[PDB]
Design a protein around this ligand. Structure first.
Ligand SMILES: N[C@@H](CCC(=O)N[C@@H](CSC(O)OCc1ccc([N+](=O)[O-])cc1)C(=O)NCC(=O)O)C(=O)O
Ligand SMILES: N[C@@H](CCC(=O)N[C@@H](CS[C@H](O)OCc1ccc([N+](=O)[O-])cc1)C(=O)NCC(=O)O)C(=O)O
Ligand SMILES: [Zn+2]
Ligand SMILES: [Zn+2]
Lengths: 176, 183
């Protein structure tokens, strides 16, 4: 069965002083087509492209997306890099050059075998109004808010089919 | 030239051409979690809290569906509310949390293991933690028996590391104030 609350806590340790100031900075996902992904994360989800890095020899680019005010992005190159990479909760989208031309290529979202990663999740003020707008924009849904068992929780998909949970923190406790 | 050239990297201009300003309806959206399935929650809780210094900020159990959820984050333990409902609203409104999904029974199934996304079929790559000193953090990780994908001075990007958790998910260990002098 599951762990009890006491057992789970016994498995946890206090933060060592050496981990002071550590922060969970990014989640990296590979994207087939950066044009489609950038449109989705900025226009549909409202994130900001805070940094773009290109690696010509290794043939890939990185796009960092985050919920930051665009006016906070530093102008200087090195300051910009340090600022973007010290923001909490960023998405690092990796574009391996040439995948958009390969009709037989697609990335795996982790929700069918083999499974592992499941989804990223965005907290919103109102799951119903967010999803009504997503519907109007033609967003693909795994789960609309009242579909299935948990009412008021949704799962949408990005252009690669990665699942994105849409949740209201103040309604999670009464889910079902 | 005649044939349509292969797609390559986007120019900075091409990338910005696909970006739209944020609609006001999304102004309070936040990136709250990354969900990873874990084979054994005991090993994962020990790793994330003892090795990486994260805090268990919420635990959820779903008896009928036979799974539990463990939320880990870099939060002060004293900020965790006492009441069950207040605790949930607070934990699920924190930015940058990890949601660990334990499907009951995987820990005793010797034929089972999750996939980390870095071998066929690929998708997800890694999570990343920003630290003040990659070399000192990785020296400690080595002392603790942490599995590495890339030590700080391994490969071309010196000063950047990748470690793995109990399920083999990759975790980047980076110092944001030195990333600009990489390459
Ligand atoms: N073919 C690869 C491409 C992605 C890739 O190679 N990423 C590398 C870290 S980049 C990186 O180090 O990031 C460097 C940087 C980022 C952002 C900035 N900035 O803020 O501007 C500046 C510099 C990597 O994973 N190395 C680990 C290993 O396999 O051992 C893939 O995963 O599909
Ligand atoms: N066998 C599954 C288990 C994990 C699982 O099913 N999680 C579901 C969201 S629970 C959830 O969203 O959350 C319900 C809740 C969480 C936290 C709190 N809280 O903070 O107390 C309260 C309530 C999910 O992925 N649903 C989409 C689908 O499969 O169609 C798997 O993915 O491996
Ligand atoms: Zn990364
Ligand atoms: Zn989730």
């Amino acid at each position: 069965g599951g762990l009890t609350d006491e057992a789970a806590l016994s498995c946890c340790s206090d933060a060592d002083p050496s981990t002071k100031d550590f922060l969970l900075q990014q989640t990296m996902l590979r994207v087939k087509d950066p044009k489609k992904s950038l449109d989705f994360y900025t226009r549909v989800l409202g994130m900001t492209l805070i940094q773009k890095c290109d690696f010509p020899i290794m043939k890939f680019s990185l796009y960092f997306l985050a919920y930051e005010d665009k006016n906070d992005i530093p102008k200087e190159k090195d300051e910009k890099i340090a600022w973007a990479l010290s923001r909490k909760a960023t998405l690092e989208l990796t574009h391996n050059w040439g995948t958009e031309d390969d009709e037989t290529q697609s990335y795996h979202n982790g929700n069918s075998d083999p499974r592992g990663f499941g989804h990223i999740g965005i907290a919103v003020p109102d799951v119903y109004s967010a999803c009504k707008r997503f519907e109007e924009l033609g967003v693909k849904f795994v789960k609309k808010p009242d579909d299935g068992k948990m009412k008021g929780l949704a799962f949408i998909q990005d252009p690669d089919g990665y699942w994105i949970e849409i949740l209201n923190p103040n309604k999670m406790a009464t889910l079902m």
